[PDB]
Amino acid sequence: KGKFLVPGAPTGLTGLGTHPSPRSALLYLYHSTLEKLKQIPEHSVYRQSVEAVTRHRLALVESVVPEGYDAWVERAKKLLEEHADQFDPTKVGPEGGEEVQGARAVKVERDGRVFVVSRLPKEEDERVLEWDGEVDEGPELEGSRTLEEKIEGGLEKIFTRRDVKDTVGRVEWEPEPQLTAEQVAELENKIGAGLIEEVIQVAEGELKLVDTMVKARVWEPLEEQPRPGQWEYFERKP
Amino acid sequence: PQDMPPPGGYEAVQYKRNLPSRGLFRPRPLLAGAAVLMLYGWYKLVKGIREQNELAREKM
Amino acid sequence: VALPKDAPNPRAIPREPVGEIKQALVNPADKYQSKADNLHKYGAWLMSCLPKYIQQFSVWKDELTIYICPTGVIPVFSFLKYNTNAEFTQVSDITAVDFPTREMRFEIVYNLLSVRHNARIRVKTYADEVTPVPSITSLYMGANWYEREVYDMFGVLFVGHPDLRRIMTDYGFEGHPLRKDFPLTGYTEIRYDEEKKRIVVEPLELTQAFRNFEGGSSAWDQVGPGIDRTPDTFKLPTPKPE
Amino acid sequence: ATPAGPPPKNFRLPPPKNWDEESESTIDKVGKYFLMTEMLRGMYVLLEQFFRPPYTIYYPFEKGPISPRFRGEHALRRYPSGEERCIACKLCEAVCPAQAITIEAEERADGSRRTTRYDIDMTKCIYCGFCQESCPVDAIVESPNAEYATETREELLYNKEKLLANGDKWEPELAAAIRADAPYR
Amino acid sequence: VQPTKFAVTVRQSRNWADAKQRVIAAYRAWIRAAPEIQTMYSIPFPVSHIRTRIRQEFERHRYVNKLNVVDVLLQQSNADFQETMNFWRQQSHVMAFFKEEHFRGEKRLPSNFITGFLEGRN
Amino acid sequence: SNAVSITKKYTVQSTGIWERIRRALVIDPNRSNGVPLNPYNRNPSPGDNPPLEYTDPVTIPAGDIADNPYWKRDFRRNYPRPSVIAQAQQVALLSVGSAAQPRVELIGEEGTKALVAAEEEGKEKGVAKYLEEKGAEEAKRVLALTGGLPPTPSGQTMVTGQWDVHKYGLAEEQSYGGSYPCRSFV
Amino acid sequence: KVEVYERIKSLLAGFDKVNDPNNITETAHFANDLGLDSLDTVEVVMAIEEEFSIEIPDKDADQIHSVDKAIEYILRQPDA
Ligand SMILES: *P(=O)(O)OCC(C)(C)[C@H](O)C(=O)NCCC(=O)NCCSC(=O)CCCCCCCCCCCCC
Ligand code: SF4
Ligand code: SF4
């Protein structure tokens, strides 16, 4: 029953819902951070500090393994090779495709490790969904139209969009097993930085920080010396 | 001297929530009470209108 | 009146006598030396991590101040917001102080709060009448009105600020009242004029002039130079004899 | 959001409960909705207050309580002999947070240090008691009086004549208030 | 724009060519708005009289040769423009801008030495 | 139960037939009516408190006539000066260590000049240039100062005896229980 | 068109900052020929914008520096 936390379930902090796949999100973020820090010199303490905190937290995230992970990985690895065209971002786009009624999935490479990002149709009431969630792009252009407005109306989509039932050449992506609720609590007890959801938030911010630090080159000599008397207050001479 | 607490210390004062339930607002007796008035009223209304109907017969 | 049976008169209970009260002499600065080393180490690590912009840091009691050049305002506050060892995710306050003896007369003071680490930090930069400062509105939404207040009271521009306008002074108010050279009662005053049937601004005229008793300041210094409390881990070693 | 260290025990809320899992019977649920039970209970509270004694006092026939420390209309006081208590130290003029006091002084005809002007602008005064605290001779005090609203603003510019007359009229209160609170001053 | 009606994000000018465009852009918005300003505050002057005041305000700062100072003046102009076109100013504020409507006149300084001396420093 | 007895709440009580009526009709008979008792409340008036009883207290160290020199308790003039570290000072602290922990021996002569060398070097090259010449090993040394990992900000409460975060935890007694969306933290 | 020019004279001749009237041509320039400094030019284009009741973009206004440039610009704009 309470073995696995429910994605979207309120955590207690308003607007912070329970994470769908929290362990892999941390691995994705940490590995994305280490790779992004490779463009900083080795004498930057900033780089040395982020590395120490991330590789230490990374080691702890790897220390907790979802039940049956090894069984899942073999098939999932086996599935990527035989259907690589289905998950390569260069073909289906970084979002996995324009079909939202269907499931999307993209292989991605970070820090020497590979991740699959998956997107699913939102669970919505059948009484309210129209055409199983297919995007409404208005009606087609009927009447006497020029060629130009036909192309502006996405007529080429006729030759490339796929019916949602049409799954002949493609395969169903199977999700990674999840950490149990007991496993989540003991892992975040190891990190000691709040709830798993907050720890992911801190990882997302830390990933965002590297780009600012590189663009600012914060490891180089002081940009502007303080001119004499700049920081002199009313202190009495000792 | 100065304003000081009593040697024993002041006794504890009520601060925790105290909004005790009462039977005057439980819905089950209220629903039973309302049903009895309606049932009694319709019993009196059947007897009333039937009598009123017989008075119209005599008047006509 | 009808009294409560178990509520006796609380004044009627005699109190135990009090005699020779003894209170020890406490220096309140001593309790912060336990963390004096840690605050210097944190300031030093920040300086090492951002040497291009952090000019100096200072530790007074439990308050750590970081002194930076205006160009590094965005990089430094990004680091204080997003670093895993610096999660100062709230701006408590932004304000300014005026120092006419300085070429950069305006000192800009930011106070930050890290709820996760239960810590506070102070960041100081400087500005001029014509030298702007980067707005931190892109990192902190709460910073929006604080920068408008600094601009209203001191005339400091924040580049990147959306909607930098007055927040406190009247519309069409001339001057920046928190400048040391701005006089206390200002320059003008208003009244209702019965000919114009409206309110009119006029040159300021006080029925009783302000009396400044600043000249009564003590002819002798009353505080002294104070005490040095730099920890040993941040004082230089000394050569041994012979 | 949470403090550093491991998450507080049981900080994470349990998952939301579905309608099916609510531990409350339908009849009770329907009854409260249609009968408005909690609104009836709130109305019953008002009837309880309807039969409790009101807190109203009939002012100005009755008055609310004030303390010996109460800060009202200013007065200048005398010694029992009738000599002015004021010796023009200017301590009250210097401490005044609102600059409401203006004083001038010279030697009196007998050579005594006395004031020639003692004005208080009652439309500048913030009624803080700082003058009364600073006075070394108990010359300036705030009376308990608060009922002196005036027709014109000029009537609130007190000179020395107005203040010494106030002290003459209010002296028994002024001494009683000083008598009660002087141990704490 | 985004925050409120006439809100302009604070930016530095890149060069003197950039600054001049903004100054002309600022003047153009001001004298264009002069008809609306008249009817919006019921100013008892013609748009011609209002538009002259706009030019003089821009002419007090015609001789500025410092880029940072221009950025300050441009920011002030945008702030005044926004608080005028939004009805944030009141008729008292805009009317006070016209120096003729002070009961001591507009020539509030002595014409020469001897008029100020005979009246007593103006 | 939650309620304290009406018999202990310093308010006018009902009597006789009216108290029985009150206990039979009100929602909670232990609830007071907020009317204070005239023999107990502000009785006597503070203006009739005997002035001679109250004693202005004096603590004997601060208020002794014998063994309290002012300079020993003059804690205002013993105020801490702010401890200021510039980029030059940190380079010196990295080059030759500190007084609590030096980097080299620095014994008398040839060490006094060696120490001042670490000062003028700190002035000339800042922290960044110093680290860049020395390389990644110096960067690891800066983190070695804080024990390998970067330091954490000091906490602001000393209840446990050390400066730290306050360990917010749910109170064993939830005032609303679970019937309302508000939780008691101790 | 020619109807625009006859309206153009109605405002430039009425302008008090012209060095000398009748100096207007079909291709006269505000600066070189008519002796108008920067802001006097800003005002002239604003007066033309009022006559044709069409707002002129600041970039388009910078392009307009001559009597012909305005005559050409107004014709392109649909409103008049
Ligand atoms: P032309 O060659 O004649 O002049 C072009 C300029 C002005 C660019 C100069 O040649 C020049 O080089 N100037 C130097 C830089 C400069 O232009 N300074 C910037 C000044 S901006 C300025 O003055 C803004 C003032 C706006 C005031 C508007 C009116 C006041 C508000 C109230 C309106 C009326 C009441 C509602
Ligand atoms: S009222 Fe008291 S404090 Fe003020 S001048 Fe007179 S003696 Fe001094
Ligand atoms: S009460 Fe306070 S404000 Fe009023 S005169 Fe005395 S010191 Fe000044």
Q: Output the DSSP codes for D80-117.
A: TTS-BS-----HHHHH-TT--EEEEEEE-TTS-EEEEE
Spell out where chain A has E strands: 104-110, 113-119
D2 touches C at CB < 8 Å: yes
Helix H or strand E encompassing F136: helix F136-145
Q: How many helices (H) and strands (E) does chain C have?
A: 3, 9
Residue A170 burial by CB count (10 A; 0-12/13-18/19+): exposed, middle or buried?
middle
Number of domains in chain E: 1
* D and C touching (3 or more beta-carbon pairs closer than 8 Å): yes
Please tell me what resolution, in angstroms, this structure has: 2.4
Give the three-state DSSP class for B23: helix
Most C CBs within 10 A among A30, A54, A197, A224, hence the mutation to make, goes to A224
Q: Which of C48, C49, C55 sits opposite A226 (nearest CB)?
A: C55
All residues of chain E having their beta carbon less than 8 Å from the beta carbon of residue G58 are 21, 24-25, 28
**Nearest-by-Cβ selection for F150 from A53, A219, A220:** A53
Is residue A3 within 8 A of residue A180, CB to CB? The reply is yes
Is the Cβ pair B20, F3 closer than 8 Å?
A: yes
Q: Are A28 and A41 in contact (CB under 8 A)?
A: no
Amino acid in position D84: E
C-alpha–C-alpha distance, residues A28 and A115, integer Å: 7
**A115 CB-side CA count, 13 A:** 18
Residue D75 alpha carbon to ligand 2 centre in Å: 11
Chain D residues within 8 A of F169 when measuring between CB atoms: 8-9
SS3 C133: strand
Q: Distance between CA atoms of A42 and F131, rounded to whole angstroms?
A: 10
F162 touches chain D (CB under 8 A): no
Give the tokens for residue A78. Answer: 């086996």
Q: Report the structure determination method.
A: cryo-EM
Distance from the first to the final alpha carbon of chain D: 47
H helices of C14-55, in order, are: 36-49
Contact B2/F57, CB-based, under 8 Å?
A: yes
Among A49, A34, D89, CA closest to F141: A49
Nearest ligand 3 atom, CA D140: 6
Find the G55 Cα to ligand 1 centroid distance in Å: 21
Q: How far is the CA of D157 from the centre of ligand 3 (A)?
A: 13
Question: Token pair 């605050």 is at which residue?
Answer: C39
Residue D12 contacts residue A12 (beta carbons within 8 Å): yes
3-state secondary structure of F29: coil
Contacts of F138 in chain A (CB under 8 A): 43
What is the Rg, in whole angstroms, of the alpha carbon atoms belonging to chain A? 25
Which residue in G has a C-alpha nearest to residue E56's C-alpha? G39
Burial class (CB in 10 A: 0-12, 13-18, 19+), G30: buried
Which of these is catalytic: G37, G58, G62, G79? G37
**Which residues does chain B have within 8 Å of residue C4's beta carbon, measured at their own beta carbons?**
none
Report the run of H or E that residue E77 belongs to, with start and end.
helix E67-85
User: Residue A175 has what DSSP assignment?
Assistant: P
Q: Beta partners for C51? A: none
Is D86 near ligand 3, meaning CB less than 6 Å away? Answer: no
Burial class (CB in 10 A: 0-12, 13-18, 19+), F32: middle
Rounded Cα–Cα distance for residues C13 and C11 (Å): 6
Q: Closest ligand 1 atom to the C-alpha of E80?
A: 31
How many other CB atoms sit within 10 Å of the CB of residue C8? 12
Under DSSP, is residue A54 helix (H, G, I), strand (E, B) or coil? Answer: helix
CA distance F67 to G58: 84
- Distance between CA atoms of residues F96 and F120, nearest Å: 12
- Cα(D128) to centroid(ligand 3), Å: 6
Domain ranges, residue E18: 1-122
CA distances in angstroms from A230 to C70, C101, C105, C154, listed in the order given: 13, 10, 9, 18
Phi, psi of E29 (to 5 degrees): -60, -40
Identity of the residue numbered D179: R
**For F14-18, which contacts have Cβ atoms below 8 Å and span 24 or more sequence positions?**
F14/C2, F15/C2
Catalytic annotation present for G37: yes
